[PDB]
Each structure stands twice: as C-alpha cells, then as structure tokens.
Design a protein around this nucleic acid. Structure first.
Ligand SMILES: *C(=O)[C@H](CCSC)NC=O
Ligand SMILES: [Mg+2]
Ligand SMILES: [Mg+2]
Ligand SMILES: [Mg+2]
Ligand SMILES: [Mg+2]
Ligand SMILES: [Mg+2]
Ligand SMILES: [Mg+2]
Ligand SMILES: [Mg+2]
Ligand SMILES: [Mg+2]
Ligand SMILES: [Mg+2]
Ligand SMILES: [Mg+2]
Ligand SMILES: [Mg+2]
Ligand SMILES: [Mg+2]
Ligand SMILES: [Mg+2]
Ligand SMILES: [Mg+2]
Ligand SMILES: [Mg+2]
Ligand SMILES: [Mg+2]
Ligand SMILES: [Mg+2]
Ligand SMILES: [Mg+2]
Ligand SMILES: [Mg+2]
Ligand SMILES: [Mg+2]
Ligand SMILES: [Mg+2]
Ligand SMILES: [Mg+2]
Ligand SMILES: [Mg+2]
Ligand SMILES: [Mg+2]
Ligand SMILES: [Mg+2]
Ligand SMILES: [Mg+2]
Ligand SMILES: [Mg+2]
Ligand SMILES: [Mg+2]
Ligand SMILES: [Mg+2]
Ligand SMILES: [Mg+2]
Ligand SMILES: [Mg+2]
Ligand SMILES: [Mg+2]
Ligand SMILES: [Mg+2]
Ligand SMILES: [Mg+2]
Ligand SMILES: [Mg+2]
Ligand SMILES: [Mg+2]
Ligand SMILES: [Mg+2]
Ligand SMILES: [Mg+2]
Ligand SMILES: [Mg+2]
Ligand SMILES: [Mg+2]
Ligand SMILES: [Mg+2]
Ligand SMILES: [Mg+2]
Ligand SMILES: [Mg+2]
Ligand SMILES: [Mg+2]
Ligand SMILES: [Mg+2]
Ligand SMILES: [Mg+2]
Ligand SMILES: [Mg+2]
Ligand SMILES: [Mg+2]
Ligand SMILES: [Mg+2]
Ligand SMILES: [Mg+2]
Ligand SMILES: [Mg+2]
Ligand SMILES: [Mg+2]
Ligand SMILES: [Mg+2]
Ligand SMILES: [Mg+2]
Ligand SMILES: [Mg+2]
Ligand SMILES: [Mg+2]
Length: 109
RNA sequence: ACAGGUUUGGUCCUGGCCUUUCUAUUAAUUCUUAAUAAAAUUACACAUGCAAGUAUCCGCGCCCCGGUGAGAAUGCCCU
RNA sequence: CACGGGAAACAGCAGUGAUAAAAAUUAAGCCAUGAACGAAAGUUUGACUAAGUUAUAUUAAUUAGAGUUGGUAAAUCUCG
RNA sequence: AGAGUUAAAUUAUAACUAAGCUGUAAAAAGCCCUAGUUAAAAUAAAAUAACCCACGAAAGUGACUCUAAUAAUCCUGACACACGAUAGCUAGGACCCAAACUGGGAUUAGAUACCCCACUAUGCCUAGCCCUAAACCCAAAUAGUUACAUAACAAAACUAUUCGCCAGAGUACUACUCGCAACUGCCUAAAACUCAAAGGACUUGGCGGUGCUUCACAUCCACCUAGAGGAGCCUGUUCUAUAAUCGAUAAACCCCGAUAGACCUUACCAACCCUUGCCAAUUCAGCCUAUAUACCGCCAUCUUCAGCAAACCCUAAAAAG
RNA sequence: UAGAGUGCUUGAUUGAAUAAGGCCAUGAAGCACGCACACACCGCCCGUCACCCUCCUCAAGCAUGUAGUAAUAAAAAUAA
RNA sequence: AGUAAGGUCAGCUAAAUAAGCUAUCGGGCCCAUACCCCGAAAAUGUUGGUUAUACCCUUCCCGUACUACCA
RNA sequence: AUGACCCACCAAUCACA
C-alpha cells in the first residue's frame, strides 16, 4: 500500500557543474508534509505522473539534509537525466507500508 | 571369430564404435497343464509363534546344524 | 576385541515395517537320512523329508502369442 | 678451455669541398651537429678457401698463434651423475651495428601489420641461474645379412641381443599432485563430458593475387573509327499506384513471349447471368489452377570448344592410367 | 493488322581509319608446382564478442562421521 | 557571472569566382555485397549600417578553452 | 575483404505355353 508522506512544488531550475557533469537541479518548496531521502518519489505534471524513483541528491543550502520539513526549500537532483523539470511541476514523496494478507480460502467446516 | 556394418568425391592403410553368439536379473506384452531344479534388494528396524534337549536326580549336549557376505586384499597351495 | 559402554538385537523357519528395478507358506511330519541324549526300547530336532507358492530354467504335451520386414539381417503392400 | 693477436668493413673525431643527405612500387616523416673525399682508436663480427665434409656425446664448431686436450682391450643400461640451441633472469662491465617494445611517416574501410625513420630491452664480456626447441637426419644402441620380398609416399628389405616408448578422437604441452636457485616457470600428467569418427598416403577433377613458355586479331594492353552515359522525345524494366493478368528478369532479362493490347485479342477487375455445360457415346464434358524441382516438345549457354563413346587389350592392381 | 512501332527481317547505294607492336595489369592454351577444396574459391575455414545450457575445477567457510600411545599391578600370602 | 579567440554546408576545413574533404541520397564498378570511382542537393548564425569589395565595425544570439560561482 | 544451411547414385525387365 502506497500512503503519502510529502508534497513539494518546483519553482526554479538550476544547472550546476560538479565533476565536469552538468546536473539539473529542481528548486522545490515543500507545501504539505515532509520529504525524506530514503523514500520513493513520483513527479506530477498538471495531474499526469511523469516519473517514478528516488533522488540522487537532496541538498538544502550547501547542506545535505535527509529530512526537509514543511515550508523548507530543497534542491533535488534525480538519477534520471531524461527527466525534464519545468517551472510549475508538482512532486509527491510517498512511502510503502506492507499489508499481510491471510488466506482467501475459508474451509467450509 | 569364418566374420560383418560405419571415416572418403573416391581408393588404400591405420584406428575406434557397433552388429551377429551364450547366460542371469528386472520390466513391458502374452500365458493351458504337469514334473524337476532354483528361489536372490537390503550386516536397516522387527509384532507373534516355533527353531535344544535328553536322562532315575549327576551329567552330556545347546551358532554343531542352520544363516549371512559385513569386514579384511583378505588370501590359494604347502610346511 | 567386549572386561566395560551404547543399549535391549530373526544375518535360524516363517512372517512384518522401512527400503529397492527386485515380492515363496505366519504350512505338515519326525516316516527316511543326519545330529543330541539314553544301557535300552525311545524321545527331541523350522536340519531335513514330503508338500505349498512363482513362467526363473529345462523337459513333456493338452497350450498362441510376441518381435520384426531400408542396409548390416530372414521378411511389405495400400493408405495417412 | 684458457691466454695472446687482427685483415676487410664500420664509427667517435677533426680537415677540406658541396647544399642538400636518407628513403621507397611511389611518397612522407627523419637529418641537414648532414653528405663525398682524406685521416682514425674502441666495440662487434669473422669475404674467398668450402664444388670441402672434418671434429665433438649431443647442443655445437670453419680469422690467426701458442698452452692444455678429445673415457673404455670399446655389448645393452636408469628416474642416479654430468651436459644441453635460441630466448629469458640476477649482478657488474661493454655498445660499432642489429633490434622485440615504443614514438613518428605512409598504406588501408580499419592497420594496434606488411613498407620508411628513430630509439630501447636484448644480441657481447665476467660470474651465477634457467633446462626449453620442427633439441627432427621426425629413422633408438650394438652386431650382422642382401636371402624371402613391393599397401601408398618417403631415405630399399630384414635378422639377433637389449632398452625406451605406444591401447580411438577431442578435452589436454590442461586440472590436481611430488620435485626443482624455476613463483606468468619446467617437469610428471588425469577425469567428467563430447563425438562416431579422428588420423595416414594416394587418385581424378576443380582452383591458384604460383612459375615458365606460347598466344589474343575486334582483342586483353598499346592503338583506330562511330556511339552510349548529359537534352527532348519513343519504347521496356523497376518501383511506387490501382477493384484490376501472367511469363522473362547476371553473362544467358530489359522494342523480351508480342512479325504487335481501342472492342475483340484477354488470360485480369467489377457487376450481372448459365449449370451433362462445343463432341457419336460416356456418374461426364470443362479448367490460361499448382508444380518448368515430374516432363515431351522447342531453345539459351559454355561453343567455331574439341572432344564424347561402345567393343577389346595392357598395369608386381586398376580410385584410375 | 481493319487500322496501328522511332520495333523487327531483308535488299541496295556511297564508303573509311588503325593493326607490321606488347607480355607489366585482364583473359586463353600447354607444361611444371601447390591444395586442409570435391555443392569443387561464390570453396573451405580461425578467434573474440553476444544468446542460452551442460560438466569439471578452485573457493572464506559450514555441516556429518572418523581415533592414540606411557609405565604400572597382578604373584604373594594368611589361617588351619 | 567574467575572459579570450572565435561562428563559412549535417561534421571539419579553404578563401572572397561562395569552394574543397567526411556525412547524406543517386549513379557506376562487381556474379553480388562492401571498399573504391563519379554526380546531386547541401550556406558566411538573426538585428543595424555602409561603402569601388565584404573576410570592416555594431546589435541580438550562440557556443566553446579559461577562470570564478552555483541545490 | 566477404559469400546460412542443405543436394546426389543401394530398385528391377520384356516375350511365350
Ligand atoms: C537551495 O539551496 C534552495 C533553492 C531552491 S528555491 C528555487 N533553497 C534552500 O534550501
Ligand atoms: Mg578420413
Ligand atoms: Mg559418403
Ligand atoms: Mg573396423
Ligand atoms: Mg518378475
Ligand atoms: Mg556357511
Ligand atoms: Mg580396507
Ligand atoms: Mg562383536
Ligand atoms: Mg527370516
Ligand atoms: Mg540367533
Ligand atoms: Mg514389506
Ligand atoms: Mg526374483
Ligand atoms: Mg505381490
Ligand atoms: Mg529322525
Ligand atoms: Mg529316530
Ligand atoms: Mg514341527
Ligand atoms: Mg665509444
Ligand atoms: Mg621532408
Ligand atoms: Mg674471415
Ligand atoms: Mg675415444
Ligand atoms: Mg653403456
Ligand atoms: Mg641453455
Ligand atoms: Mg643471454
Ligand atoms: Mg646487464
Ligand atoms: Mg643497446
Ligand atoms: Mg634500425
Ligand atoms: Mg604506428
Ligand atoms: Mg672466458
Ligand atoms: Mg639442430
Ligand atoms: Mg621425437
Ligand atoms: Mg639407448
Ligand atoms: Mg593396435
Ligand atoms: Mg581420453
Ligand atoms: Mg612446452
Ligand atoms: Mg603445465
Ligand atoms: Mg592428481
Ligand atoms: Mg570491343
Ligand atoms: Mg546519335
Ligand atoms: Mg551521348
Ligand atoms: Mg540520354
Ligand atoms: Mg511486368
Ligand atoms: Mg504460371
Ligand atoms: Mg516472375
Ligand atoms: Mg540466367
Ligand atoms: Mg480489353
Ligand atoms: Mg471483355
Ligand atoms: Mg479462367
Ligand atoms: Mg529446367
Ligand atoms: Mg577427335
Ligand atoms: Mg600402382
Ligand atoms: Mg580408359
Ligand atoms: Mg506499320
Ligand atoms: Mg605441402
Ligand atoms: Mg580430399
Ligand atoms: Mg573467399
Ligand atoms: Mg562479415
Ligand atoms: Mg559457403
């Protein structure tokens, strides 16, 4: 079961040069909830879902921070280079909890 | 072995594999009756019954027969 | 090896679990041979004798089915 | 094995002279502190003789001189002993010239090659290792014979005494062991598994960017003439296109089946129609349906190529010639 | 062919140039030589890589099973 | 962000007749593919200005080596 | 420079009574 953790809207897109590699950076503002580094993420464009996966780098003001709270600005670089970050995109951080099912079989007796 | 098939476009040589014979176990398919012979997966575990007594007391018999091939290169033959 | 120790013994005849491709009777007699004991008549003996079971093999007849038919290697026709 | 020596080259290095020298099928790069001549140590390597066939156990040894020297009254014999080409390793010395590597230059689709230039390890000396070669004259040592006698090819066939080896092919000069100055090593040397062959020699073809001869007569080069390939048309292919045939489709198709399509032709497409439906008869006519890889008929092609083939005969065996 | 070609098949007219060489590249013949080819060079064939599968080996380690020698004492006696 | 060279065709390059090598398509060669040999199309980045010329200067884009700095 | 795989020789007549 996928239950939601946090949601953040992108604002500005940056190109940062580290180790001779241009890294697209999504500047984000966390609206409702929080974002955590280990959780799974999905990107949302005007109601569509563009991407599924985990960040490469979540970095906030020259510090790498595992958990950004609400109202916190956070830089986000994905591992997927094919992903395009626009000015108005939405981002949903979700966590997966495990539901343990019992037998669908009930013996008559 | 009285031999035969098979290397190659072909021939010779060399060289393996296989066929043909005979027996035993198992299996498949078939199966009428006798006789004789033989009876065999297992040194894994065993319900029950029987397998050692005789005899005027002592005594004498009681893995001898029977079982098995576990172990051991054990050993054969011979002093 | 067997003082000891694991532990509670069919590798006697039958049987039975397990196991394996592997499947004989939980049978009758001491009448004959052998063995034990007895001075002896005799008793005992799943040794054994006579039977039961089984195409495992031979033989005898009452029994016909299996395999094979391109070559080696006996033997074929029409369909699919 | 020692010690000593050096003729021909080559080079450091000067002296003149010249602007180039080097280098290839052809260039480039390199060098001009280069080249030619005249002078020259060291180092390394040993024309001719050798058309000889000697020495050594083998590996090996062919400039000159001297010293020392080539086991056994001579059968075979190891895993024991002592040696063992090149490469390679360690340490010290040498360095003319050659040269793995590497760097440049060409070449090429690429070229981590062949070709060009530079230069190194290394080739040399001393000392120690290493122990391998197509270490193959693929033919064991020692005595013999030339009798019997052809698988093939090759270097003719064999006896006796020995020793060493070999039991399909791969897997495999591999994996594991033991030993070894070897540590990417040598030696010794399996099995699972896979296959139904793997090998040896020959035969006739075909082929060969193999060599030597001889040619080409519209024929390859050399050469002559007129054209094609560019334009417009004509006509055929291929595609694409259509509801809308088929066949040819390297040489050996492409104004080809057609010396011939407006209807017909005609096989195609679309609508419609007809079911003993060309004929003397026939549970029969009819089919331009499939197969040209079942065929006959006609041909193309090698080809203006010279061979094919029956019947025989010959060959210490014959596939064939 | 009724008609349909710049096509085809035939007849005729005017009417040249060059070749007297070459074996280096192409091709042909003969002879040598080679062949791992024989569907016969449009032949055959080698290794990586890629896709699966089989089997051996080597593995830090882990399970289960597996046992030794050393000197002794023991031949001495009591009571009847 | 600054700096310096720069921008000629899809890629690199020459010059000022707008061209040559690869890429691309199309022909040819070959029994056939590939190499190879030809042919075609392919533009001086958009703004502005001139002149006997644009390879002069500017605007707005651009990129690149170099520095700084970027979540 | 290159050019899937696969291709081949293992059966006997006619005629007469
Ligand atoms: C990064 O540092 C962040 C910038 C994103 S806002 C566009 N601000 C704070 O963490
Ligand atoms: Mg063979
Ligand atoms: Mg054959
Ligand atoms: Mg044989
Ligand atoms: Mg049975
Ligand atoms: Mg016994
Ligand atoms: Mg033993
Ligand atoms: Mg015991
Ligand atoms: Mg029993
Ligand atoms: Mg007992
Ligand atoms: Mg049972
Ligand atoms: Mg049985
Ligand atoms: Mg039964
Ligand atoms: Mg009795
Ligand atoms: Mg009695
Ligand atoms: Mg009884
Ligand atoms: Mg010197
Ligand atoms: Mg030069
Ligand atoms: Mg000399
Ligand atoms: Mg001597
Ligand atoms: Mg000797
Ligand atoms: Mg040596
Ligand atoms: Mg050396
Ligand atoms: Mg040295
Ligand atoms: Mg040197
Ligand atoms: Mg040199
Ligand atoms: Mg080079
Ligand atoms: Mg010396
Ligand atoms: Mg030699
Ligand atoms: Mg040898
Ligand atoms: Mg010898
Ligand atoms: Mg043999
Ligand atoms: Mg083997
Ligand atoms: Mg070797
Ligand atoms: Mg080895
Ligand atoms: Mg071993
Ligand atoms: Mg001509
Ligand atoms: Mg004309
Ligand atoms: Mg023309
Ligand atoms: Mg034309
Ligand atoms: Mg057509
Ligand atoms: Mg047809
Ligand atoms: Mg056709
Ligand atoms: Mg043809
Ligand atoms: Mg018509
Ligand atoms: Mg009509
Ligand atoms: Mg029809
Ligand atoms: Mg034909
Ligand atoms: Mg003739
Ligand atoms: Mg002959
Ligand atoms: Mg003949
Ligand atoms: Mg006409
Ligand atoms: Mg040869
Ligand atoms: Mg052959
Ligand atoms: Mg070839
Ligand atoms: Mg290829
Ligand atoms: Mg082929």
């Amino acid at each position: 079961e996928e239950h939601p953790v946090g949601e953040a809207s992108i604002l500005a897109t940056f190109s940062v040069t580290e180790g001779k590699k241009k890294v697209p950076v999504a500047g984000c503002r966390v609206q409702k909830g929080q974002l955590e580094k280990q959780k799974k993420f999905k990107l949302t464009r005007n109601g569509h879902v563009i991407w599924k996966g985990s960040l490469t780098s979540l970095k906030h003001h020259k510090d790498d921070i595992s958990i950004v709270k609400t109202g916190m600005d956070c830089g986000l670089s994905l591992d997927e280079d094919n992903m395009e970050f626009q000015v108005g995109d939405r981002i949903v951080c979700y966590e997966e909890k495990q539901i343990q099912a019992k037998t669908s079989w009930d013996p008559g007796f």
